[PDB]
Amino acid sequence: IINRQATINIGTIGHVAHGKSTVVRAISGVQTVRFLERNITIKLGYANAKIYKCQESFKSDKEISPKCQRPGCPGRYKLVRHVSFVDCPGHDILMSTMLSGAAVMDAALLLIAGNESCPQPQTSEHLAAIEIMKLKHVIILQNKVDLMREESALEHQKSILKFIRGTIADGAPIVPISAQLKYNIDAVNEFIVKTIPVPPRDFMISPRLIVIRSFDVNKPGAEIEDLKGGVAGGSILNGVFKLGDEIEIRPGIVTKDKGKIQCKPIFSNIVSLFAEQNDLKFAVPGGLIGVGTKVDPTLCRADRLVGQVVGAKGHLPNIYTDIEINYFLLRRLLGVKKQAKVRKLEPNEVLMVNIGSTATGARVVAVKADMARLQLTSPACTEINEKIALSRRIEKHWRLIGWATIKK
Amino acid sequence: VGLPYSELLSRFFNILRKFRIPPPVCLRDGKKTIFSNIQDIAEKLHRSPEHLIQYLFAELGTSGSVDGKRLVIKGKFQSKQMENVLRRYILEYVTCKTCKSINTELKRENRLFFMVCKSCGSTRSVSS
From which residue to which do the C4-type zinc fingers run (chain B)? Predict the structure, then answer.
């Protein structure tokens, strides 16, 4: 049976070590690629999910496989829609990817677990970001209620309610779910279907493609006569992509190995698009689709193409080697279950910077009150606008300070 | 919002489903790891002997051939660390969080192992 592709985008965000990718997998089908040459490049979750409802109410309806033989129905399901899930990590360091997801997303999913502290900063920050980037459709989900008694969960719920009062987003459904049981997904599907009004996309504004992961799709030991192009796995923000376009890669790569950075962008052409299961001509925006471009298998490796942007010939994405950031500082450092005050910046020290889709190490040049200048080592770019989140060295692993804006 | 939640909780409540460990009498036999009580373990806990070998391989860089009851696997390893490994296997490798059931059988559904329980019928993903 011929199946349609994705039009509506759904994103999942939470906290680190809680479990998000697994949840996504449970929701969808086959196992994701990220987290030698294939699969791994940057932390993300991608799998195909099917919306086929059987109406002949309650919660139970949806299934994993196209052939349905679980509750008690012999026939086929009526056509609704199709989705390709994109997952971003809920880390205080990994924020650029989340931001990228935000602009793309039509539907949001938030996760809170009942094993840690109640007042949470990262989640609040995420919510604020969502509020900023013109979004209203937010769904609250509960992570693990397996070893919990009876009243603790209720208390947690009450606390959550108390917390969400003076915020913009109010129209939110609350569903308690499990990740490993492979049940309680039909209800989620139903929720996704019913509560959210479906928004359409326009193809008049200038098209953009953000490549987070780089791939080389071939057998280990491929022949010279039959060679496939380097597939660039990227999420599409806006603009319908079709076969027959001249694509460029923006930031530029260090080719001399004295050190120069000023060079021309890298041009490439599309061979084939990989979506769902069967091959398609047109690509509908809202999801991570494998764009097979004419790029070498040697170029796509690990820590060089992390967050490199893709656009059509003669466009507006901006190239950066040095970056301008205008930061707003909070009262105290947040994230600890010990608290320390935010100090003024010090010259020449390695810190990690997140703009657009990139997560790379950088060096501090100048000290000011509101603005900062930073030198980059591995390729970085800024798309339309998007927020900035900074991560600094305090104790072993990187920690958050607050939020920032880009003036350029 | 605090109205469609109680029903869900009720539903969750509705859908809800050690002596079995044999005593291992083995001292730290040197050069090559030899186990004679392994067969009993395989039997009582209901699992293939090859799976245990695979697990061992995954754990440590050891080279050995399969012998049919007592195994010949290279490595001078301790009796308490083997015990620990066994305990781990009993716990977070097999069994289930929602129900503490005994009988678990092997079925393969894409290439990696997905173990199933015979008391009810629920799938779990184990790799790490």
Answer: 96-120
User: Is there a single domain that holds both residue A150 and residue A263?
Assistant: no
Domains identified in chain A, total number: 3
Q: Is B125 left (phi over 0), alpha (psi -120 to 50) or beta?
A: beta
Q: Can you list the positions of beta strands (E) in A120-239?
A: 138-142, 174-176, 208-214, 231-238
Which of A296, A316, A336 finishes a domain?
A: A316
Yes or no, beta carbons of B124 and A147 under 8 Å apart: no
Last residue of a domain, one of A163, A186, A201: A201
Residues A265 and A366 placed together within one structural domain of the fold = no
| CB-based contact A50:A82 (threshold 8 Å) | yes
Spatial distance between the Cα atoms of A22 and A32, rounded to a whole number of angstroms: 9
Q: How many CB pairs under 8 A join A and B?
A: 36
Alpha-carbon span A240 to A229, nearest angstrom: 21
Residue A50 pairs in a beta bridge with A82
- Residue A361 sits in which domain range? 317-408
**Cβ within 8 Å of residue A198, ≥6 positions away:** A7, A8
Q: Do B1 and A182 touch (CB under 8 A)?
A: no
- Cβ-based interface (< 8 Å): residues of A facing B: 22, 25, 30, 59, 145-147, 153, 157, 161, 172-176, 180-184, 187
Q: Are residues A312 and A361 in the same domain?
A: no
**Claim to verify: residue A154 and residue A221 sit in the same structural domain:** no
Residues A43 and A188 in one domain: yes
Give strand pairing partners of A360. A353
Do A190 and A253 belong together in one domain? no
Cα B47-B51-B56 angle, rounded to 5 deg: 125
Q: Which long-range contacts (CB under 8 A, 24 or more apart) does A163-172 make?
A: A163/A119, A167/A127, A167/A131, A168/A131, A168/A136, A169/A127, A169/A130, A169/A131, A169/A135, A169/A136, A169/A138, A171/A136, A171/A137, A171/A138, A171/A195, A172/A138, A172/A139, A172/A140, A172/B1
Q: Which two tokens stand for residue A184?
A: 């309680």
Residues in chain A closer than 8 A to B97 (CB atoms) = 146-147, 180
3 state SS of A145: coil
- Other Cβ atoms closer than 10 A to A163: 16
3-state secondary structure chain B: CCCCCHHHHHHHHHCCCCCCCCCCCCCCCCCEECCCCHHHHHHHCCCCHHHHHHHHHHHCCCCEECCCCCCEEECCCCHHHHHHHHHHHHHHHCCCCCCCCCCEECCCCCCCCCCEECCCCCECCCCC
Are residues A48 and A28 in contact, defined by beta-carbon separation less than 8 angstroms?
A: yes
Q: What is the resolution of this structure in A?
A: 4.6
